[PDB]
Design an enzyme around this catalytic site. Structure first.
Site, PDB file in Angstrom:
ATOM      1  N   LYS A 292      42.035  22.063  17.662  1.00 19.25           N
ATOM      2  CA  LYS A 292      41.637  22.706  18.926  1.00 19.25           C
ATOM      3  C   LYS A 292      41.701  24.246  18.847  1.00 19.25           C
ATOM      4  O   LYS A 292      42.677  24.796  18.351  1.00 19.25           O
ATOM      5  CB  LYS A 292      42.562  22.208  20.058  1.00 19.25           C
ATOM      6  CG  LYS A 292      42.427  22.948  21.402  1.00 19.25           C
ATOM      7  CD  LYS A 292      41.078  22.664  22.085  1.00 19.25           C
ATOM      8  CE  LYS A 292      40.782  23.631  23.237  1.00 19.25           C
ATOM      9  NZ  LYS A 292      39.455  23.287  23.900  1.00 19.25           N
TER      10      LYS A 292
ATOM     11  N   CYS B 204      33.088  30.879  23.072  1.00 19.52           N
ATOM     12  CA  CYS B 204      33.614  30.157  24.247  1.00 19.52           C
ATOM     13  C   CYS B 204      32.909  30.619  25.537  1.00 19.52           C
ATOM     14  O   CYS B 204      32.929  31.816  25.853  1.00 19.52           O
ATOM     15  CB  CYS B 204      35.129  30.329  24.368  1.00 19.52           C
ATOM     16  SG  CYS B 204      35.845  29.493  25.837  1.00 19.52           S
TER      17      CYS B 204
HETATM   18  C1  LIG Z   1      35.849  18.696  25.840  1.00 16.48           C
HETATM   19  C2  LIG Z   1      35.230  19.876  25.130  1.00 16.48           C
HETATM   20  C3  LIG Z   1      36.090  20.788  24.523  1.00 16.48           C
HETATM   21  C4  LIG Z   1      35.606  21.711  23.591  1.00 16.48           C
HETATM   22  N1  LIG Z   1      36.467  22.630  22.999  1.00 16.48           N
HETATM   23  C5  LIG Z   1      36.006  23.522  22.055  1.00 16.48           C
HETATM   24  C6  LIG Z   1      36.895  24.422  21.433  1.00 16.48           C
HETATM   25  O1  LIG Z   1      38.138  24.307  21.571  1.00 16.48           O
HETATM   26  N2  LIG Z   1      36.377  25.300  20.491  1.00 16.48           N
HETATM   27  C7  LIG Z   1      35.025  25.297  20.149  1.00 16.48           C
HETATM   28  O2  LIG Z   1      34.590  26.066  19.285  1.00 16.48           O
HETATM   29  N3  LIG Z   1      34.160  24.420  20.770  1.00 16.48           N
HETATM   30  C8  LIG Z   1      34.645  23.529  21.715  1.00 16.48           C
HETATM   31  N4  LIG Z   1      33.775  22.622  22.302  1.00 16.48           N
HETATM   32  C9  LIG Z   1      32.322  22.680  21.906  1.00 16.48           C
HETATM   33  C10 LIG Z   1      32.037  21.624  20.833  1.00 16.48           C
HETATM   34  O3  LIG Z   1      32.752  21.961  19.655  1.00 16.48           O
HETATM   35  C11 LIG Z   1      30.541  21.552  20.498  1.00 16.48           C
HETATM   36  O4  LIG Z   1      30.180  22.834  19.989  1.00 16.48           O
HETATM   37  C12 LIG Z   1      29.629  21.140  21.682  1.00 16.48           C
HETATM   38  O5  LIG Z   1      30.255  20.159  22.505  1.00 16.48           O
HETATM   39  C13 LIG Z   1      28.213  20.698  21.230  1.00 16.48           C
HETATM   40  O6  LIG Z   1      28.292  19.526  20.421  1.00 16.48           O
HETATM   41  P1  LIG Z   1      27.959  18.039  21.030  1.00 16.48           P
HETATM   42  O7  LIG Z   1      26.510  18.073  21.495  1.00 16.48           O
HETATM   43  O8  LIG Z   1      28.266  17.057  19.921  1.00 16.48           O
HETATM   44  O9  LIG Z   1      28.905  17.816  22.196  1.00 16.48           O
HETATM   45  C14 LIG Z   1      34.249  21.703  23.241  1.00 16.48           C
HETATM   46  C15 LIG Z   1      33.396  20.774  23.840  1.00 16.48           C
HETATM   47  C16 LIG Z   1      33.866  19.863  24.780  1.00 16.48           C
HETATM   48  C17 LIG Z   1      32.943  18.724  25.133  1.00 16.48           C
END
Ligand SMILES: Cc1cc2nc3c(=O)[nH]c(=O)nc-3n(C[C@H](O)[C@H](O)[C@H](O)COP(=O)(O)O)c2cc1C
Ligand SMILES: Cc1cc2nc3c(=O)[nH]c(=O)nc-3n(C[C@H](O)[C@H](O)[C@H](O)COP(=O)(O)O)c2cc1C
Lengths: 313, 313
Positions: A44, A131
């Site tokens: 995380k 972020c």
């Molecule tokens: C619950 C949640 C928490 C996330 N926390 C982070 C984070 O801590 N750091 C980060 O770089 N991206 C974070 N993301 C973004 C994801 O790493 C990813 O870039 C984004 O969800 C797109 O991918 P997906 O289409 O598979 O969901 C988070 C996404 C979600 C859904």
């Protein structure tokens, strides 16, 4: 036929891993990702001090994907550093550690302490410049001068190979400028495209209300909504940064979706929303599905089709 | 119960219209939109000279929406001006004319000639600051100093009320800056959110190829993919421009989707991808569907729920 790959001086059983923030906050989460069939895992995104994050409800899922405004809830840098130094079993799979300081100074403070552990254990840094969910803090990499500053300061203080998590762009001029900045920094060995599509808004028709509490309902989008956006960014940086690796993230639910990311230029393939909804069993399914596409097409290794997407005429 | 409403010193039978570029290039197209049950119509974005546009294939549709790189194909400003001055039957419904010059000078040239016809006939200008598809020409409203210059020069040369077609934003600081620019100009009476989500990439798994020819396959996204992004932008500008009207565009397929746009702040509701796929029959269905939702909920007028989306305490 196999999914094995070697990069950044590490060996991986397959290209799949979690996306930062999904199934990776607690020791329990990290042990679970380690026990799964994934080729790697990432922790995380962390800050110097522990954070509770934003008020609930802060995550909601739907047929076409997810919306979230988590607020960087995490156990603090001291915890993730200890996991990497003392707890992780590197004989199982490689570990990445994600950091997301709220200023350049905060990031520099963390990397000064991370460096000796990276040298000894081989943990790999992913620096989060994208972020979209902390109130009053716009995505760092949408400001190219701030981007250059963060990268200069981190490069100097860390002195070791690292990677960068980027926000999605929607403008050819922005692809051109962002990739040129990255190419100024030899220590940047990988580029992860993409973080969530920022500040979308989901509304429930029956209740006539937004579905998440923070920021008047505005939050980052993932899942089915964002696949063509993610593929565009992966290919744009693969073309513009020929001396670096690109990691794909966004809209992966199937072996076919992973195949498209790899065709676009991806080395590792990260899974967020789909993993949050389905759980870690997803990794055996993704492996099986990618191998069957490869078999049908007569591909024996990933190198036979990585970056080989065809254009018209 | 009927859906009729008054805006900009005109009367409309209902809030529905085509999105600029869909079913509105030829005299035939324009007659067809006029014969439909839509409350208004808008003409294809035009340039001083006729244009052939980008090479084919340049549009493709899918279950979740569309990708395009049309390249501003149009019959030329002289044609659309003549349609407005001599051909349109204003007793049926109001007309908007969209312009998209490749420079500030080109836009100024067009508005000087539009002004007398606007004075005589009441045709309404929509100024396009968000085309993402012309090679070497980035979205104007992603550059705030260029955006300000276009609006200063157009305001002075035209001297009459008009509106602006905006690109989607993804960053709170960008919403803040863009709305502040718009609020400098009293002649800007409506803001249309949004144009296509720029420079996405669709790839076919079987053929391993991109699906459109221009720009190595990179093109603007519409349809199911973009609804949360469109609602966010409508609400952001509705909140920040309290003395202007906001027109919603993006991801409308049903009366329910239109209900969500109006709840977010939309006055008129534009239909692109869904109209391209279904044809002009869509307008009777959208009207029937919206009236049913209103009856179930006890709403007699659009004013009763416009902009009334609820947040979480
Ligand atoms: C619950 C949640 C928490 C996330 N926390 C982070 C984070 O801590 N750091 C980060 O770089 N991206 C974070 N993301 C973004 C994801 O790493 C990813 O870039 C984004 O969800 C797109 O991918 P997906 O289409 O598979 O969901 C988070 C996404 C979600 C859904
Ligand atoms: C075929 C095609 C042509 C378009 N041409 C224009 C145009 O001339 N001017 C403009 O402002 N937008 C144009 N657009 C963008 C649409 O007006 C609209 O903003 C976008 O398609 C999103 O709405 P949707 O989700 O209903 O498709 C075009 C879109 C498509 C599909």
């Amino acid at each position: 036929m196999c999914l094995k790959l070697n990069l950044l001086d590490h060996v991986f059983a397959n290209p799949f891993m979690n996306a930062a923030g999904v199934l990776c906050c607690t020791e329990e989460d990290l042990r679970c990702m380690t026990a799964s069939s994934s080729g790697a895992l990432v922790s995380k995104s962390c800050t110097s001090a522990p954070r509770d994050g934003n008020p609930e409800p802060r995550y909601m899922a739907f047929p076409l994907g997810s919306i979230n405004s988590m607020g960087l809830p995490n156990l603090g840098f001291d915890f993730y550093l200890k996991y990497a130094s003392d707890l992780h079993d590197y004989s199982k799979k490689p570990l990445f550690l994600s950091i997301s300081g709220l200023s350049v100074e905060e990031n520099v403070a963390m990397v000064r302490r991370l460096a000796p552990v990276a040298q000894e254990k081989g943990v790999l840094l992913e620096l989060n410049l994208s972020c979209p969910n902390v109130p009053g803090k716009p995505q760092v990499a949408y400001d190219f001068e701030a981007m250059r500053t963060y990268l200069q300061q981190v490069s100097l203080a860390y002195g070791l190979p690292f990677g960068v998590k980027m926000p999605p762009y929607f403008d050819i001029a922005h692809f051109d400028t962002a990739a040129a900045v990255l190419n100024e920094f030899p220590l940047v060995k990988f580029v992860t495209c993409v973080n969530s599509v920022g500040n979308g808004l989901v509304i429930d028709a029956e209740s006539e209300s937004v579905v998440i509490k923070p920021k008047q309902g505005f939050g980052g989008l993932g899942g089915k909504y964002i696949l063509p956006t993610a593929l565009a960014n992966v290919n744009a940086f693969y073309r513009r940064c020929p001396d670096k690796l690109v990691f794909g993230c966004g809209g992966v639910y199937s072996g076919e979706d992973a195949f498209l990311h790899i065709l676009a230029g991806a080395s590792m393939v990260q899974v967020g929303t789909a993993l949050q909804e389905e759980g870690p069993g997803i990794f055996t399914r993704l492996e099986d599905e990618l191998l069957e596409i490869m078999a049908r097409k007569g591909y024996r290794t990933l190198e036979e089709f990585r970056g080989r997407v065809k254009t018209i005429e």
